[PDB]
Amino acid sequence: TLWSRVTKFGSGWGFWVSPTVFITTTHVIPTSAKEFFGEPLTSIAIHRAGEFTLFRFSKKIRPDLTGMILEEGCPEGTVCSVLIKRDSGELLPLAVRMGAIASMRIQGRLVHGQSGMLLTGANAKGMDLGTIPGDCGAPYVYKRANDWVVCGVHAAATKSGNTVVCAVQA
Amino acid sequence: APPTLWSRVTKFGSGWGFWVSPTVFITTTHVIPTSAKEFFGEPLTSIAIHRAGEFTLFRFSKKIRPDLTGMILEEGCPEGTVCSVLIKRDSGELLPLAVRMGAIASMRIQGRLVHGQSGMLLTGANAKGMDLGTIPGDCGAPYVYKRANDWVVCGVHAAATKSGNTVVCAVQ
Ligand SMILES: Cc1ccc(CNc2cccc(C(=O)O)c2)s1
Numbered sequence: 001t002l003w004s005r006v007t008k009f010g011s012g013w014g015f016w017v018s019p020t021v022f023i024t025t026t027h028v029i030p031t032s033a034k035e036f037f038g039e040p041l042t043s044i045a046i047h048r049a050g051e052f053t054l055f056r057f058s059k060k061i062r063p064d065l066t067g068m069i070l071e072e073g074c075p076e077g078t079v080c081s082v083l084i085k086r087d088s089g090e091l092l093p094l095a096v097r098m099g100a101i102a103s104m105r106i107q108g109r110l111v112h113g114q115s116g117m118l119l120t121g122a123n124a125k126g127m128d129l130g131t132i133p134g135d136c137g138a139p140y141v142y143k144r145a146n147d148w149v150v151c152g153v154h155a156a157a158t159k160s161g162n163t164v165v166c167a168v169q170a
Numbered sequence: 171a172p173p174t175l176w177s178r179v180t181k182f183g184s185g186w187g188f189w190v191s192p193t194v195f196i197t198t199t200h201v202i203p204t205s206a207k208e209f210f211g212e213p214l215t216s217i218a219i220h221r222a223g224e225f226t227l228f229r230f231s232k233k234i235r236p237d238l239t240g241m242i243l244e245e246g247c248p249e250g251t252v253c254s255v256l257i258k259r260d261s262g263e264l265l266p267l268a269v270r271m272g273a274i275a276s277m278r279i280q281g282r283l284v285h286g287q288s289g290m291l292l293t294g295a296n297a298k299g300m301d302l303g304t305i306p307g308d309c310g311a312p313y314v315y316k317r318a319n320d321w322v323v324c325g326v327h328a329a330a331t332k333s334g335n336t337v338v339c340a341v342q
Contacts (some may be wrong), residue, residue: 002301003263079295081302083175093293093302109299118269120252121290126316128254128266141230142295 002141002148005065006085012136014087017150018067019060025137025153025167026053037061050166051114051155073114073168074098074151078139080116082154084131084163092128095119096140096164104165106156113155114166116140123160130161140166171254175314175321178238184260186310190228190232191240191322198310198340199226209232210234223232223285223341224328228310231338246287246341247271247324253289253313255327257304266304269313271324273295277338279329286328286338289313297335304330304337313339 005016012028022037026048034041036055045056048087074080076099084092096116101113124130131154138154152166178189180325183206187197196335197207199221207214209228216221218229247253254266297303304311304327311327 005215081294083301088264089262090266091259092266092268094268095292119270125250129268131254143298 002083003085003091005062005068006083006137006139007095008085009137012134012138012154013155014137015083015150016062017070017140018042019062020057020064020072022055022057022061023070023150023153024053024055025138025155026051027155027167028137029053033079047170050114051165052153052169054169069147069149071149071151073101073166074140074142074149078142079119080132080133080142080166082138082140082150084135084138087134092129094131095131096166098140098166101170104156106163106165109156110166111156111165114140114152114168116164116166118162118164120148124162125137131157131164132161134148171191171256171264171316172321175312176236176258177313179258180233181258182308182310185307188237188256188312188323188326189238190243190274193230193231194240194243196323196326196342197226197228198224198328199224201310206311207209219342222224222340222342224338225286225326226309226342227342242320242322243342244322244324246274246339247313247315247322248300249273249292251277251315251324252292252338253315253324255304255308255311255313257308257327266273271313271339276340277329277336277339279338280332282339284329286340287313287325289339291335291337296329296333298333302323303335306329315328325330
């Protein structure tokens, strides 16, 4: 299942692309650490691009997994799924219609990534129909031919929880 | 979704059912074991059954779930209502799948004739597979939504298209 790749990390979540590759949102990462998942920070490559961070481990941390396709966002009009895990034990896949890459003003801060709008729309008044701040690092995925593609990580949302930003690679 | 609603979702037959109150249990007709003569330690003779197609309601002559309060059961919901389908999956994983509800429909789904309130999943481009969509084992899971200040149950999961986003909620 895709869902066993979504992992609690720092102040949010991350996603196992492969046995050695983990992606997350830069702001959720601990600022004090000597190891992650039992490997010394000494042995980990860190590639940061604004709110997107990729970790490459020097041994197989998740040898139960196959490697997946990671791409720099997706075409406009693609309906992605954001794979949200909650501390409650809920799994909440939500449909997101994707638009252009932009630098957007979101609750008083500038965030660069792929814009999206949830298909739940109008509102939520309902934590099960929108994102909350704790959800940052959740992956954006879609099916293409036979394959799941991951195309970024949850970086920010407006107060409704219904306009979102997907941070992307490079 | 609140813990008091997940606590009402009970493994039953080939799927699930749902406690509306201490004495009322609803489910999808085809998940009921056809040989069964006893439910929650009560003989069939002491149970009132109300059945309409894929919707079945059991009413007991004593309190089976006294920890619960009675809640509101309605005959489906207004067109445009966004519901959550409360699906339990392998390992205390809880999957509240978001569905936009539409018209009362009759459909042919994988060859079987089904009737109830139709809806479209809001989980992805299409919901094929178990990560974004429903499976036969989910049948009898409740459709719920929050009003004003409270939660309503308006039916039970009866069927879904294999390659698609369309579900059917059986209704009272
Ligand atoms: C073999 C399949 C994999 C997934 C299927 C679609 N879901 C679904 C849910 C609930 C009842 C039904 C039904 O066809 O009764 C289908 S069908």
